[PDB]
Every structure is written in structure tokens, then in C-alpha cells.
Design a protein that fits this description.
The PDB classes it as growth factor. Keywords: growth factor, receptor tyrosine kinase, heparin, ternary complex, signal transduction. Crystal structure of a ternary FGF1-fgfr2-heparin complex. The structure holds 4 chains of a larger assembly. Chain A is mainly beta. Chain A has one domain: Trefoil (Acidic Fibroblast Growth Factor, subunit A), CATH 2.80.10.50. Helices cover 0% and strands 35% of the residues of chain A. Chain A is built from no helices and ten strands. In chain A, the strands form four sheets. A four-stranded antiparallel β-sheet of chain A has the order 4-5-8-9, with no helix packed on it. In chain A, a hairpin with a 5-residue loop joins strand 8 and strand 9. Chain A is globular. The relative contact order of chain A is 0.24. Chain B has one helix and 19 strands. In chain B, strand 5 and strand 6 form a beta hairpin. In chain B, strands 2-10-9-5-6 form a five-stranded mixed β-sheet, with no helix packed on it. By secondary structure, chain B is an all-beta fold. The chains are: A mainly beta, B mainly beta. At the A-B interface, loops of A face strand 2 and strand 19 of B. One nickel (II) ion binds next to strand 10 of chain C. The site of one nickel (II) ion has 2 residues of chain B, from loops.
């Protein structure tokens, strides 16, 4: 079943646009937020849009984007932090700690400019509707 | 001439309509209004009056900061909270939606970065550690690379399972150790490497 | 209840206490006030009542916006301006310090965006412009890269302003500069004429 | 010539170079590290240094103001007297990018990349020592 990936910082849902751009909304009605979490191994996930079937990805500069071909840049490490929120790192650029995020306004937040103590990396899986 | 019906004095602070949080948290809702006479404020849970006694722990209100506050939030609190600012010239209202989520019990959690890798000259005594946070006692086992060296409850105690020792190493001991922990909700696990010198 | 002593309704706008500006400019001081009954507002120049007849061109007030406006400020405006908001339950006040600055004598100044680059087909007539503002008639000369024209005896100021180039050639293509100066300093901006 | 103060219209502060090497803005006319000393190499080029920590205002490769003790390439600013009679200072080195010296309304340095011609953050006026 699908879940939404609500970010605490702004309180937006994680979205992948047909335009392949990765932002964040608040429109519970929006279709491009109804994410589909899938796991390779345990702790490794694939988040794809149940609409444009796009796989959340992060290129070599730490920039979230919607690709249509599931690949190395689509592998994220889902983790439940002590505070009970979820934090997703880039398998690929994991060594540095490039988390998925969003700035207080609902826009992707460059992997490099991000960090552990940030409310931008914390997510919550909420029901469909 | 000096009349004035309620107006918002800080729209950016009301931007976040949906409040989704882990239970036990504290939540604050704000409705910064302006107006003359100074407007009054009241809060509504799902439409009707939100009596203090309507939730364990009650709720605080900070009129000087136009806010409502609920501590140690619980699943029962889920709902719609609406403020209602008013004076004799009119009123304004806003509505926040709160979704509190009970996340425990959950899979065991391993403090990131651990176990820490290591390396030592043949004959030396290396050490490995696995810290696991849990509201219970998690099943934890050490796996060598298949051999399961230690296991919580089996051969080593809990206090003992936290630290995997390896006295008088060798070039054989060179490999990928693993910390596997878990419960009925699931498991977590992190590896480390022992480089023999 | 309905008793309310004057309060600041917008502390932000009041952040800037020191207002330093070029002479001639128009300054505005604001003191957004709240209070029931509605407070009243009055201004004070250097501690005393700032009466309209205290400066040339008096001053406008905006009750709606709790402000004071002074147009074409002069050095004689230098001072502290204090607003006093008050009603029967109390009063509040803020003070702004105004420092008007005569920037003259200063180097010439060239109207930004001039000279404007150009480009034309061989045969036509290209043009270049340089407008300069200075306390005294500015010494201005066009420099093609040799000194083309130069304001002096045979070239007047209104003439020097615009540099014409009739029936161009591929040789005229290059960097035309407008250099201007006075006893205090000099400034200069270039422009490129591309030949087609 | 003599020591001047570089007042920024935006928030209404004096440019300031801290012993720390950090560049910010104060409102204290008495503060010491605001007594700047403008010196010009070529005409149009300048060096702003504290007549105390003898530090020269500078901008690194990411447009970030800092106090230097060794006058260097990142110390040269292009002094320009604008049409409205305020001064704007640009990084000689990063000039291509149009990275001006600036202060946010709270009196804190403004990173070059996030500054522009239209901002009141970049407008200064030299004022008397006292
Ligand atoms: Ni709900
Ligand atoms: Ni827990
Ligand atoms: Ni069990
Ligand atoms: Ni003064
Ligand atoms: Ni002038």
C-alpha cells in the first residue's frame, strides 16, 4: 500500500513532479505525493510515485530528482532515528551523509547542505487518506 | 475612525496547517491577531468548545503570544483545532489539523557508526561494540564472515553481548563482523571490519 | 479589559534608529502605534515641538500610517526626531537621529547604462552617448582604442555628450570610452561598436 | 585621508571588522573597529582597513567578508559613486559576478552571491570620524 512522506521542518509531503523535479506540497489531494516504498535488502528502499512511477533519486551533487529508470541513484537507506522519525540517506553518496530533505518552504535541499541535527531530514510515513 | 475588526498579524506562522507528530511530543498552535478593541481568543476541538478537562494533562494557552499548547501528546488528541479571534466588530478563525502517531514499539535501533571498524598487528587484542536502544531487550547476535560467535541469552549475557572481544587475533580473524539486533517488529544491523596487520 | 496603554504595533519598521542620507532626499520616520482609546501622535525635533514653520517646506504627517515625512532634506534638518504616542493610560516614544550628508564636491557621475554598446552594417551612422553630472563643468574626452573628441574650446558640453560616427568601417569596431573628471576625481565607462 | 565610517542604509549600521576577523555591522558610534581607513591603489580601486586591528576588508572565493592582516587580491574593492549619491563596493577579484559588500537589516555580512544592484544592502555613505 502507498504512504506519504511528511517532512516536519515545513510540514510538507515529499513530491516528485512529472517534470522530474523534487519539491514538497501540503495539498493532501495532490497525486504526486502518494509514494510507494519498496525494499531491496532490509534497510534499503525505493520510493516511487504510484503515478509517474518515478524513483526518487539524488545525482552526484546531492540533488533530489525524479528518474524513470530505477538505478544506483535510486537506492536510499531508510532509518528510524531515536525520536521516531525516518531519515533517508543516499546509498550512493552515503559516505558523506547526504540525506533527503526539504527547506521550510517545500523545496529539495542539496545533499551537501544538510545534516543530522536538521529537522529537514525527518519524515513520517502517513496513511494514504 | 479608530474601529478595527480582527486581522492576522503574522500569516507566515500559520502556514503549517497539518501537524503530524510522534506521540509524547508537545505541540503549539498560534493565531497572532491584531485589532481594536484587542480581539479575544478561544479554541475549538472538532468544532465544539475545547474544555480543559477534555484531555489528560489539559492544555496551556498563551494569550500574549496567541497560542495553544498541548504537552505529552497522545493518539486521543488527533483532530481539528480551531482558534476564534473576535471583538464586537467581527471575527476571524483558523483551523489546524493534528495527527499524532504512536511509533513504539518499533524495530531496535543501533547508534549509527557502530560497530566501529578496527585493525591490529597479529597477536593483539581487538574490540567491537554494538549499542542498541530498545524499550525491551533485543535479540542480538554477532555473525562472522557462516558463524554466529555470540548471541544475547544463549552464550553471552546482555551486558556481555554489547562488546565483542577478540584476544590474540590472527590473519584469519580478518573479515566482516556484523551486529544484528531485533525483535517482533523487525531488525537493524551494522557491520565493521577487522584489518589484520 | 478595554483599558490599553499605547503599544508598538510594528517594532520592525523602527529597527533603524540612525537615518543618514544625501541632501535633497526625502526621509520618512514611522512609529506604528496601538492602544484603546486610540493614542495620539506628536513629533519632537531635538527635544522641542517640531512646528511646521520650523523648516522650509514644512512636513507632512500620515496619521493612518503613524508617520512623519520630510521632502528635500537639507543640512539644517540635522537632528533627533522623536515621536510621542499617548492616551490617558500612558505614553511611549521613539527617537530617530537624522544625518543629512552633502556629497558635493564629488567626482563626476555617469548615468548608468551610457555609453550604450552599438553595432551596425558598414555605411550607416552609429552613435554613442555619455551623460555626466558634476558640481562644475566636467572635463570629458572620448578615447577610441588615441583621443577622438574632447570637450574644450572647439567642442561644447552639449556636443561632447554625444559622439557620432558617420559611415562606419570595420576599422571603427572597438572599445570607445567616456572618461570624465574634475578636481575631485574621475570616472569612465566603455562601450563596444560591433561592425557588421 | 582621514578615518571615515561606512554607514549602510539598509539596516543603518557602520561597517565593522572584528579582531576575530569576522565582518559585521554595529550601531555604536563609539565602537572602535568601525574607524575604517580607505586607501586607493589605482583610481577606482581601494583598501578598507581598521585603524585598530590594521585589518583590510576582504572577500573570499564564496563572497564572504572577512578581516585580513595581509593586504591581498581579496582586499581590492571597486569604489563606485552611484547616481543617487551612495557608494557601492565591488570585489575586484570576483567583479565578473557583481559581488558587492553588504549588510543584512540585522547588521550581519551579506554573502556576495546573494547581493545585487537593487538591494539597499549595498548602499553606503562615508561619514565623519565623529
Ligand atoms: Ni487525520
Ligand atoms: Ni523508542
Ligand atoms: Ni523474541
Ligand atoms: Ni548627527
Ligand atoms: Ni551631486
Amino acid at each position: 500500500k502507498p504512504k506519504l512522506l511528511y517532512c516536519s521542518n515545513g510540514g510538507h509531503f515529499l513530491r516528485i513532479l512529472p517534470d522530474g523535479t523534487v519539491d514538497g506540497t501540503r495539498d493532501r489531494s495532490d497525486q504526486h505525493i502518494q509514494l510507494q516504498l519498496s525494499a531491496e535488502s532490509v534497510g534499503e528502499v525505493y520510493i516511487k510515485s504510484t503515478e509517474t512511477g518515478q524513483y526518487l533519486a539524488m545525482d552526484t551533487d546531492g540533488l533530489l530528482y525524479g528518474s524513470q529508470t530505477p538505478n544506483e541513484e535510486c537506492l536510499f537507506l531508510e532509518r528510524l532515528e531515536e525520536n521516531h522519525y525516518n531519515t533517508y540517506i543516499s546509498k550512493k553518496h552515503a559516505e558523506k551523509n547526504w540525506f533527503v530533505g526539504l527547506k521550510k518552504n517545500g523545496s529539495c535541499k542539496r545533499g551537501p547542505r544538510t545534516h543530522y541535527g536538521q529537522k529537514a531530514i525527518l519524515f513520517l510515513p502517513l496513511p494514504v487518506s | 475612525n479608530n474601529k478595527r475588526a480582527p486581522y492576522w498579524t503574522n500569516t507566515e506562522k500559520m502556514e503549517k496547517r497539518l501537524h503530524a507528530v510522534p506521540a509524547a511530543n508537545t505541540v503549539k498552535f498560534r493565531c497572532p491577531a491584531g485589532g481594536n478593541p484587542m480581539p479575544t481568543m478561544r479554541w475549538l476541538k472538532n468544532g465544539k468548545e475545547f474544555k480543559q478537562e477534555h484531555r489528560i494533562g489539559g492544555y496551556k494557552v498563551r494569550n500574549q503570544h496567541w497560542s495553544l499548547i498541548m504537552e505529552s501528546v497522545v493518539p486521543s488528541d488527533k483532530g481539528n483545532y480551531t482558534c476564534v479571534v473576535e471583538n464586537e466588530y467581527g471575527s476571524i478563525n483558523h483551523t489546524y489539523h493534528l495527527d499524532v502517531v504512536e511509533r513504539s514499539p518499533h524495530r531496535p535501533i543501533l547508534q549509527a557508526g557502530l560497530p566501529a571498524n578496527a585493525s591490529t598487528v597479529v597477536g593483539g587484542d581487538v574490540e567491537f561494540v554494538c549499542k542498541v536502544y530498545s524499550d525491551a531487550q533485543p535479540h542480538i547476535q554477532w555473525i562472522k564472515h557462516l558463524k554466529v560467535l555470540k548471541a544475547a541469552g544463549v552464550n553471552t549475557t546482555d551486558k556481555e553481548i554489547e562488546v565483542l572481544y577478540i584476544r590474540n587475533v590472527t590473519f584469519e580473524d580478518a573479515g566482516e563482523y556484523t551486529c544484528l539486533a531485533g525483535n517482533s517488529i523487525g531488525i537493524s544491523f551494522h557491520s565493521a571490519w577487522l584489518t589484520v596487520l
